[PDB]
Structure 1
């Protein structure tokens, strides 16, 4: 007789994004741990609380091993002969009957283990709300900064984390304002924080262009490569199979509208739009703009270019402290050399 499991199934039921069998597993692990700690002998009793009755029978376990320690769980092949060799070497089934009592020490350790189980079950709730949609621009309010991370939320008691290295260098987020970020690939097994969200990745700019531009949305214009100097300067690479709509004019929009939108959403980062081409030589003479081309030596084995450049455009060709050469090399994959 148990009206209490009936309270589990209707009266003290969970939030409805959590299954009932996990709650039954939580309570069965709770009573198993409670009878485990209470017995003075080192018995790893695992009790099978059957679902429909509520009451149960305490089950001290036994695994088929040939070791010398743990006699309370040490059964052998000749003990598996009692069930005549119909099992496996090492599974922890039982062949015993025990009883159960209650105590306030059992109550408090059961409270500890059930708040651990509902904690990891809520963690699995955030796991399935992550795995329902893989990679998108999201918005949450920052609520508690830290030394190495910025904790976030997505509503419904979810949490996300901006780490230190994947944010803007000009970040200033007082707790209480809404920020934009992209969850990319989080750890569903992480016991602490899981949802790793960035603000200074190429995935950020391409997802921002995806939500911004409808022809990125429906695959008319496509972006192939990207380049980032976070907060200051950027480059992305555009090719297009369609011949109707102007690609660069489309992604700059009406008087630099889309570029200024991503620039103010990114923090003043000068995203410099440039074409993507398939062939290496003509791709890179398209790609180092606004620098000028004298002669190009294309190298295959160590994946580099050699660029002759006339005098006058060296500063805007290299950027500031080698910014443009570095950004163009991690754009194209070919690191650049200086030639006059």
Structure 2
């Protein structure tokens, strides 16, 4: 009876994590599913259990369309003269009343859908309460490890998922440690894990500076460009709004005091901290730094940049996997060309000659 409904609404553990209104909404959905499974025909119904004043009373929704299939939930958009509709859409009736909500199959489907709804609501609430802190470094233990994704707990049953793309190729986890990342994606509609925390992205780097570098956070040393190779190398061009501060002595630290800390956080990532400039030439020179660039060729029609490096410093300007160039191509976003070594040493005073 409805006394059982009051007992189950007052006997919930998460009383305010699932308010009485949403309790009764889930219970109405339960009773609607039960009544649907009762009749062989498909007919949508609403319950309106009358949370405090009275009992439930099933109804019959029409879903007004010009179709006729299963006319139990069909009625034309113009049937409005008799039965007192005077409507165009939304015409719903209250024909059937007082269904049964306490038999075996009804109780079973009610329990199932209530479990589903409470777990969904708890997950949605615990993710939304953290969604406001999107783009910040958060602590938290990892829960379970797998070859495709890992689970994390941020406290008070805060489930977070970190996919394989968010993890570095040699990033390592075991349930028990506090792997700290940055929240980047939220999906409050996801049927499963929806709290997305990353560490392989440059925004993570930014937040790292924010928790380590006192310069950033006051907009005195703006982080402009950032490219990453997970666990391999992070090229970050940060600009200095003032003049008496050098990023080599401020963002890098005191002989590798901050860059080393952020590298250990990133699992040994060579971090090249350079200065952002409004000139593409100096920008790409700092991108491939350290090196000895003696050429610059720009093409705005094809958006290409040719940099003829010096003969002998190949491993100093290209290195393994061409990272020193690849991240550069991922720093500014233009096609960078490093081909010549001895002949066509400039590609500007020789190619055009």
Report deviation, 1:314.
1.2
What's the offset of the Cα at 1:81? 1.9
The alpha-carbon deviation at position 71 of structure 1 amounts to 2.2
| TM-score, normalisation: structure 2 | 0.88
* CA deviations over 1:278-319 (Å, ceiling 9, x no partner): 121232223321111212111112222111222121111002
User: How far apart, CA to CA, are the structure 1 residues paired with 2:10 and 2:223?
Assistant: 51
Q: Deviations over 1:14-51 (max 9, x none)?
A: 35343332112111111222222123443333222222
Q: CA distance change for structure 1 residues 92 and 152 in 2, over 3 Å: closer, same or farther?
A: farther
Q: Distance in 1 between matches of 2:54 and 2:113?
A: 19
Q: Mind listing any 5+ residue stretches in structure 2 that lack a counterpart?
A: 341-353
Cα distance in structure 1, aligned partners of 2:173 and 2:81 = 67
> CA separation in 1, counterparts of 2:101 and 2:21?
24
Give 1:90 shift: 4.8
Does the 8 Å contact 1:57/1:99 carry over to 2? yes
8 Å CA contact 2:247–2:274 kept in 1: the answer is no
Structure 1 residues 249 and 88 mapped into 2: Cα distance closer, same or farther (>3 Å)?
A: farther
Aligned length: 340
Shift of 1:186: 2.1
Change (3 A) 1:320 1:60: same
1:294 touches 1:309 (CA, 8 Å); kept in 2? Answer: yes
**Contact 2:77-2:88 at 8 Å conserved across structures:** no
Contact 1:64 1:80 in 2 (8 A): no
Residues in 2 aligned to 1:250 and 1:33: alpha-carbon distance in whole angstroms: 63
> Structure 1 unaligned runs (5+)?
none
Q: Which digits, 9 at most, give the CA deviation of each residue in 1:89-146, with x for residues without a partner? A: 3554534534435212111111001111112111221231232221111122222122
Per the TM alignment, residue 5 of structure 1 is displaced from its structure 2 partner at its CA by 5.7
Can you list the C-alpha shifts for 1:140-170, whole angstroms capped at 9, x where unaligned? 2222122311111111111111111221122
Report the structure, 1 or 2, having the larger helix content: 1
Q: Using the alignment, how far apart are the partners of 1:118 and 1:273 within structure 2?
A: 48
RMSD, aligned CA: 2.2
Q: Distance in 1 between matches of 2:101 and 2:227?
A: 65
